[PDB]
């Protein structure tokens, strides 16, 4: 087969999609009796977002299979823009219910973006770039969180609120996407298979790849077509009834669930707590959170290039294993830190290790992997399932973890460690290496595993 290359059209399409959708997502997540009322209220509001992501994940297949991947990204853009306009109206008139609805729409945007962007870039790019540009959206998510907290702090230093600059900052990616992206090729796979347009898909592939002759890739796509013709519509339920997609389904579910059950958010808002354990100043903890963001982003770029070179499997293994060791060593660390002052430092280092590990294997990979594993017609439903598992896991952890932490203290991380080890074992005995392989080949591997 002829190796594809990165063109200006593909790099700009990737950039627009990832920037608008996934960077507004990454930036957004940072933005996302009376005592008892406060805990239930606060809990409800923070619960509206992952429930929103759940709903958005459910409506992925509809939008994708009608409007296309790009069209889905544009609806993701109206679901993104509407809360901002509701914020302008909030400037005019504001209620707590509008806050709830805003976090709901923002949630929907989050889910739809997180699912569709790797799908779009996955069907757009050639297999190698499918892996790299598959990682890219999470890179923009890390960027976004980074710039979010950095610019938030810089704002606070500059002024209480940055309203015109912030509104402009949220407007720019959506504006650039809405303006430029519609003029960029749709998924050639969507065009040739679902929309049944040979010419449009041909020209799309021409502009994307940079060469005139797309024939081999198109006939490959039609190989996928005739592979999915036996399957049919493949509703989520039918997906659950299919043995051919079964281990693939279990793979997606275990991957997403494990990812969110790895205790990421615990690390997220208890980071400052361990920094307090170290004795680090609030400005200095702000600095080391900035540093963790930098680590995440940098190691996410490294995660792009290494995802392409080493493969997805080995990186999943590395990430989950490093996070497992991070967890266990963390528990022993927290036990030892109350006894000895040398340890908590170690705990800091180990936390950094965790951030790295999860930045490599667990976070970026599973979505692109959902794209890689399944075929054209079964991909969006699989994204509904995997996305649902993702946001529901984030919800479950979200509400349940406070009680577990308050009750069991440091031991809570041991459960996450068990999850990490089980997951790692699963990846060892299940997950194939999808690097450089066409969807058909990976489907043949998985089909072989399912049949036997």
């Amino acid at each position, epitope marked *: 087969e002829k190796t594809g290359k990165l063109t200006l059209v593909l790099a700009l399409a990737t950039f627009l999609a990832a920037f608008g959708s996934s960077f507004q997502y990454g930036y957004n997540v940072a933005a996302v009796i009376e005592s008892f009322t406060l805990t239930l209220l606060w809990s409800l509001t923070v619960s509206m977002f992952p429930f929103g992501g759940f709903i958005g994940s459910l409506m992925v297949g509809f939008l994708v299979n009608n409007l296309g991947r790009k069209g889905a990204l544009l609806f993701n853009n109206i679901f993104s823009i509407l809360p901002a306009i509701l914020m302008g109206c909030s400037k005019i008139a504001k209620s707590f219910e509008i806050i709830i609805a805003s976090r709901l729409l923002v949630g929907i945007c989050a889910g739809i973006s997180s699912n569709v962007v790797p799908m779009y870039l996955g069907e757009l790019a050639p297999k190698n770039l499918r892996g790299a540009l598959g990682v890219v959206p999470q890179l923009f998510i890390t960027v976004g969180i980074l710039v979010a907290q950095l610019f938030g702090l810089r704002s606070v230093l500059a002024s209480e609120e940055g309203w015109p600059i912030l509104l402009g900052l949220t407007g720019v990616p959506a504006g650039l996407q809405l303006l430029l992206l519609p003029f960029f090729p749709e998924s050639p796979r969507y065009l040739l298979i679902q929309k049944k347009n040979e010419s449009a898909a041909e020209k799309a592939l021409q*502009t994307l790849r940079g*060469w*005139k*002759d797309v*024939d081999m890739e198109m006939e490959e796509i039609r190989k996928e077509d005739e592979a999915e013709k036996a399957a049919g519509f493949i509703s989520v339920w039918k997906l659950f009834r299919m043995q051919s997609l079964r281990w693939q389904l279990i793979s997606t579910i275990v991957l997403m669930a494990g990812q969110q059950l790895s205790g990421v958010n615990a690390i997220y808002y208890y980071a400052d707590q361990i920094y307090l354990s170290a004795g680090v100043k609030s400005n200095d903890v702000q600095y080391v959170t900035a540093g963790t963001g930098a680590v995440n982003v940098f190691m996410t770029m490294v995660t792009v290039f290494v995802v392409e070179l080493w493969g997805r499997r080995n990186l999943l293994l590395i990430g989950f294993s490093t996070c497992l060791t991070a967890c266990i060593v963390l528990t022993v660390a927290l036990a030892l830190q109350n006894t000895i002052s040398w340890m908590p430092y170690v705990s800091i280092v180990c936390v950094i290790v965790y951030v790295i590990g999860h930045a490599v294997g667990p976070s970026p990979i599973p979505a692109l992997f959902i794209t890689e594993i399944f075929l054209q017609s079964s991909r969006p439903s699989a994204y509904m399932i995997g996305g649902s598992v993702h946001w529901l896991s984030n919800f479950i952890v979200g509400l349940i973890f406070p009680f577990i932490q308050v009750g069991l203290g440091p031991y809570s991380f041991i459960i996450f460690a068990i999850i990490c080890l089980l997951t790692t074992i699963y990846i060892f005995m299940v997950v194939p290496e999808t690097k450089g392989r066409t969807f058909v080949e990976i489907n043949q591997i998985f089909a072989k595993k399912n049949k036997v």
Partner: antibody
Amino acid sequence: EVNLVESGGGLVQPGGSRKLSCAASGFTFSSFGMHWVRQAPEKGLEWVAHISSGSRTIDYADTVKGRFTISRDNPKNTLFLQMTSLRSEDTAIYYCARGNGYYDALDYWGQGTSVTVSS
Amino acid sequence: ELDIVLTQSPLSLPVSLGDQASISCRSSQSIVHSNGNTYLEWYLQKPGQSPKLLIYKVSNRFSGVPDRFSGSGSGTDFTLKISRVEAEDLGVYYCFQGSHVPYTFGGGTKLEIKT
């Protein structure tokens, strides 16, 4: 090394017919588009026809539309040009050329086969 | 009918070895392809030999083409430059566009040694 060797040429009367072939080796033939290019005696090069790797794309020079048919057989690693209703205008050396898809350009040429149309 | 025409100039270029030499190719309409690429190519043919690719995508040297060859141009105007003509460079140069069907060669430019 990469080789392209054309055959099937020779002397033919006006109104007559002739089928040219081009045998390819040293590369994966089915991954590359292919062209026919001609050159009349004491004349410049004249592009004749193109066929994509999978035969989905086929194009002809204006001077041959309706008269020439280009085809290819990828498993047999062979390019063909079936010519009919030949005229004096058509007397020329016929080159088959490789379409290199990273560049889209004719990077390899055969030695050519000579076709002569006359009494 | 849609005819993309390629014009080379001059038709004949007498040179001494070591000379700089430039060859022009003009298209009757823009030859930018729908793929965003511009497929203007230069080929060299020596007597009794088959043509060989020198330049592709306006300014890129093909594998094996010495750096004394350089291609340039924009839109409708294109140039092939030879910084120092060597004996092995003598022959007929053709420009070619592969952007718009039917594809077309220029009429050729003969690069020849002075006598």
